[PDB]
Amino acid sequence: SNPSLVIVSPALPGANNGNWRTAQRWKALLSPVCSARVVQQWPDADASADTVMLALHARRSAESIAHWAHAHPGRGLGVVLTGTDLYQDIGSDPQAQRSLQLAQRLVVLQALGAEALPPECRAKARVVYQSTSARAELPKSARQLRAVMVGHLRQVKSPQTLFDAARLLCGREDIRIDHIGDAGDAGLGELARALASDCPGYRWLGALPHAQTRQRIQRAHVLVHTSALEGGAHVIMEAVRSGTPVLASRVPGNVGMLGNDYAGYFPHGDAAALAALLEACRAGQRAAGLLDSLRTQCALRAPLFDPRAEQAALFQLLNELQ
Ligand SMILES: CC(=O)N[C@H]1[C@@H](OP(=O)(O)OP(=O)(O)OC[C@H]2O[C@@H](n3ccc(=O)[nH]c3=O)[C@H](O)[C@@H]2O)O[C@H](CO)[C@@H](O)[C@@H]1O
């Protein structure tokens, strides 16, 4: 019969974040060829019928990955490198390192991912670009530039780069920055609140439901993403597949999503560089404007994030694991 797949996600069930989104999307995409379930840890009371595991995060799921590898030595294990593992933990973390060794297949979420893996792990590495539904590209007003950034506030999102750019632009009534995401890591929420009180063109909206967040991404002239690292960020896909161009920090996770030739990168942590891009976007608002050049480049990336493509890549992965 068809495989019994268990997806391990460290997200809380129903959480509005990437780790929950991937796991629930992979379950939907794989459902026509297998019996699929999502858990936070393995084993559980239903563990005896599972034949394949896809485990997100080499460190956060290392305990379930180890359980699987001990119960199924050399068979049925895929480890998904969701970001903070690939670009932080696998360097020094012995649990992350063991997960890498035990996996039958490693999944990276964009083309550059395997460059961060040990060379001995590259033969068993598999690229699975993520997917999102498209939204109609909307005509937008030339009267103002409205940027949006989306990420639950934590240090890896480097939200200070956005706060520092919003400060450089404090006086520009013709440039608006909306920031969507909960106040997680200590004091980042306080920084956003203080900035919003000083610089009215900057608004921190807190966490928003995914529906409303996709509507905000679709309506913004540009999405800004400042991260220190990303596995391959859902928010960048969401923008691209809405016809909303991106300004992103030049880090491998972002480069993997937007392309080596993309004209909308700033150096990581360079607030002045990001504020200069926002000024260019605004100056451009006929054709030849930076926003138009970036929408052209993003439109060439949009077919990467087709759910039919992700599904075909997952079908191949599952065939390799059973
Ligand atoms: C730092 C890092 O490596 N991040 C990874 C993390 O996702 P992480 O959760 O950090 O970030 P993503 O951008 O990929 O996912 C956030 C998701 O939550 C939604 N959202 C967020 C905040 C908010 O207030 N409202 C809202 O709806 C966004 O629209 C998006 O769908 O795991 C994902 C895979 O599992 C990877 O794709 C990401 O690269």
Residue numbers in the entry: 2 to 286, 291 to 327
Original authors' sentences:
A specific SEN biosynthetic pathway was identified in Variovorax paradoxus DSM 30034, which is recognized as a way to incorporate Se into organic matter in bacteria. The bacterial SEN biosynthesis gene cluster encodes three proteins, SenA, SenB, and SenC. SenB catalyzes the generation of the key intermediate selenoglucose product using SeP synthesized by selenophosphate synthetase (named SelD or SenC)15. In contrast to other types of GTs, SenB performs dual functions in two-step catalytic reactions, catalyzing the formation of C–Se glycosidic bonds and the subsequent cleavage of Se-P bonds to generate the final product.
